[PDB]
């Protein structure tokens, strides 16, 4: 091996390692910045600025073990560490070199939460946490509990009581709310939140709009939403059901307000609570749908972008180690009061991918479009649908459906590496390079990606 400088670097090596305190690694800014966490100490290296890596020991507040999962906001600016009981959100000290100051050391412990904070009674455990994609300065996190309750905490505001959507029902049997959620996932418009429930074998529901305290919205996207909103309005007639008409109007209003209160400088906008509370839309219609899958259940769901114009492809796991690629063919309308709204909740099964192995968890690295990493059993395969999704992408803006004639919709399924423990991943662009950091427990592999 040319062993020039890969895998070997200041920030990546550290002995005196305990066979416990797991380690994590995250990229940021197109594989520029790096965040490494080991022995309860955070390391960050900016492969543009910084000449050497700087660190921070947070062992004083958190003692990482194996109940924790850590995730970093896309912007990279933040980190969230949680378990089925508590949440810790820390602000990576970019630009900071010395972080020794025992007082400034705490000016990074931005948010804390523990289920044992609710009065008394049965307190259900945390099932997953997410950073809200468009939550201006990553100020909002979404916590899903066992009671399928989805809660949004405004990390940077004590004066902000959390919002709790899809609350429990005093009824019995099936009602309105979405029961038995197995996985959460945001749309690439960052306004819709997809949910994968099990109750009926597995269907898809969604929260449109799922908003944060303050929305992160650039001008390109402000318009896009705004336009789609008008096209919707323009399309209303007489056949349009009342409830739908109602929403669409309410939608154009809300969005027409986003436009007024838009902050041109920063690129944010304040979203008043009303609009924030919303009832679940769903179930979506998957079509066509393989008769087999009715026996099995859904495992996970992920969203893979295929360009930049938010044109995405939904992805669902299944028991038979099957994967399906759906395409949202109809423009949704926002909803709020409506119990069991379904107006235009439709998906189209593009392709199916059988793997037969056990599908542990789906993962995607933003930076590389049309690519999905499926953590099989002891494998990690990279399903690449850029074969046809790049064509599907043109046919969309060209309003040309001919190129899709006799085109074969097969994902070039490759194989990354082998692992036992469900790995961690990251995209590093080292010297114009596609690097895939694979962090198993002890392991810490590095590879390349086709393109």
């Amino acid at each position: 091996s040319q062993s020039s400088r890969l895998s070997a670097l200041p920030i990546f090596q550290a002995s005196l390692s305990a066979s416990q305190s797991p380690r994590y690694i995250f990229s940021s800014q197109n594989g520029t910045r790096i965040v490494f966490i080991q022995d309860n100490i955070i390391r960050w290296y900016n492969v543009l600025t910084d000449s050497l890596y700087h660190s921070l020991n947070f062992s004083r507040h958190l003692v990482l073990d194996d109940t924790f999962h850590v995730i970093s906001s896309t912007s990279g600016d933040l980190l969230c560490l949680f378990n089925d009981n508590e949440i810790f959100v820390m602000e990576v000290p970019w630009g900071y070199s010395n972080v020794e100051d025992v007082s400034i050391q705490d000016a990074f412990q931005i948010f804390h939460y523990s289920i044992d904070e609710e009065e008394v009674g049965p307190k259900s455990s945390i099932k997953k946490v997410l950073f809200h994609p468009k939550s201006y300065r990553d100020s909002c996190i979404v916590v899903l509990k066992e009671d399928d309750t989805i809660t949004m905490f405004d990390i940077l505001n004590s004066q902000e009581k959390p919002i709790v959507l899809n609350k429990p029902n005093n009824s019995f049997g099936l009602d309105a709310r979405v029961n038995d959620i197995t996985d959460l996932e945001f749309s690439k418009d960052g306004l819709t939140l997809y949910c994968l429930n099990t109750t009926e074998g597995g269907d898809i529901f969604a929260f449109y709009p799922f908003l944060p305290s303050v929305l992160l919205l650039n001008e390109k996207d402000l318009n896009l939403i705004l336009n789609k909103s008008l096209v919707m309005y323009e399309s209303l007639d007489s056949t349009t059901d009342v409830i739908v008409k109602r929403n669409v109007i309410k939608q154009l209003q809300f969005v027409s307000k986003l436009h007024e209160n838009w902050n041109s400088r920063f690129g944010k906008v304040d979203i008043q609570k009303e609009y924030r509370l919303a009832k679940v839309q769903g179930p979506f219609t998957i079509n066509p749908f393989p008769g087999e899958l009715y026996d099995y259940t859904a495992t996970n769901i992920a969203t893979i972008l295929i360009d930049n114009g938010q044109n995405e492809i939904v992805c669902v796991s299944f028991d038979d180690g099957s994967l399906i690629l759906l395409f949202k063919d109809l423009e949704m309308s926002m909803s709020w009061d409506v119990d069991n709204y379904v107006y235009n909740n439709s998906l189209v099964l593009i392709e199916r991918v059988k793997l037969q192995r056990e599908i542990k968890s789906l993962i995607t690295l933003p930076e590389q479009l049309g690519k999905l990493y499926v953590i099989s059993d002891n494998i990690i395969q990279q399903v690449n649908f850029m074969s046809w999704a790049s064509t599907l992408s043109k046919s969309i803006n060209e309003s040309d459906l001919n190129p899709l004639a006799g085109l074969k919709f097969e994902s070039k399924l490759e194989d990354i590496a082998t692992i036992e423990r469900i790995p961690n991943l990251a995209y590093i662009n080292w010297n114009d390079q596609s690097n895939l950091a694979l962090m198993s427990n002890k392991t810490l592999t590095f590879q390349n990606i086709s393109s």
Partner: peptide, 28 residues
């Protein structure tokens, strides 16, 4: 008056729906 972008958006939207029919028949 006249529309410029918004029109394009509708085309796009419509097209996605057009694509919808593609896959609905392309299978069975």
């Amino acid at each position: 008056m006249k529309g410029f972008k918004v029109v394009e958006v509708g085309l796009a939207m419509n097209t996605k729906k057009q694509i919808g029919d593609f896959f609905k028949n392309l299978n069975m």
